[PDB]
Amino acid sequence: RPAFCLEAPYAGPGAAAIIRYFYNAAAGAAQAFVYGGVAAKRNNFASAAAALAACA
């Protein structure tokens, strides 16, 4: 499992309210989070499926 899959989700400083997915390693699950539209980190995916494919 890539190390970035352990990062906490990062909304960043933007003002958009975009639904994105992160891998929650403790939950063994991809979960939705709000991304502000800038300054993304790597644990940040378009869908649950893309999160799981990278990290599960």
Numbering used by the authors: 1001 to 1056
The authors write:
Here, we report a structural and thermodynamic analysis of six extensively simplified BPTI variants, where 19–24 of its 58 residues are alanines, using differential scanning calorimetry (DSC) and X-ray crystallography. We used a stabilized BPTI- (BPTI- A14GA38V12), containing only the 5–55 disulfide bond, as the reference molecule instead of wild-type BPTI, which contains three disulfide bonds13, and a BPTI variant containing 19 alanines (BPTI-19A) as the template for further simplification. However, the alanine substitutions exerted a small unexpected enthalpy stabilization, and the magnitude of which increased in a nearly additive fashion along with the number of alanine substitutions, which was, however, over-compensated with entropy destabilization. A structural analysis indicated that new water molecules were recruited into the spaces created by the alanine substitutions, facilitating protein–water hydrogen-bonded interactions as well as interactions with the methyl group and creating hydration networks around the substitution sites.
We mutated the exposed and partially exposed residues (P8, K15, R17, R39, K41, R42, and D50) to alanines because we expected that these substitutions would minimally affect the densely packed interior of the native protein45. The mutants were named according to the numbers of alanines in their sequences (i.e. BPTI-19A stands for a BPTI variant containing 19 Alanines) and a suffix ‘a’ or ‘b’ was added to distinguish variants containing the same numbers of alanines at different sites45. To provide a structural view of this peculiar instance of enthalpy stabilization, we crystallized and solved the structures of six simplified BPTI variants containing 19, 20, 21, 22, 23, and 24 alanines. On the other hand, despite repeated trials, BPTI variants containing 25–27 alanines merely formed needle crystals, unsuitable for diffraction. All six variants crystallized under the same conditions, indicating a minimal disturbance of the surface properties, even upon multiple alanine substitutions. X-ray crystallographic analyses indicated that all of the simplified BPTI structures fully overlapped and that the main change that occurred upon the number of alanines was an increase in the solvent content in the asymmetric units. The new water molecules were recruited around the alanine substitution sites and were involved in novel hydration networks. Thus, favorable protein–water interactions appear to be the most likely factor responsible for the increased unfolding enthalpy of the simplified BPTIs, rather than the relaxation of atomic clashes or the creation of new intramolecular hydrogen bonds or van der Waals contacts, assuming that the hydration structures remain the same for all alanine mutants in their denatured states. Finally, it is noteworthy that a protein in which more than 40% of the residues are alanines can fold into a native-like, well packed structure that can be crystallized and solved at high resolution.
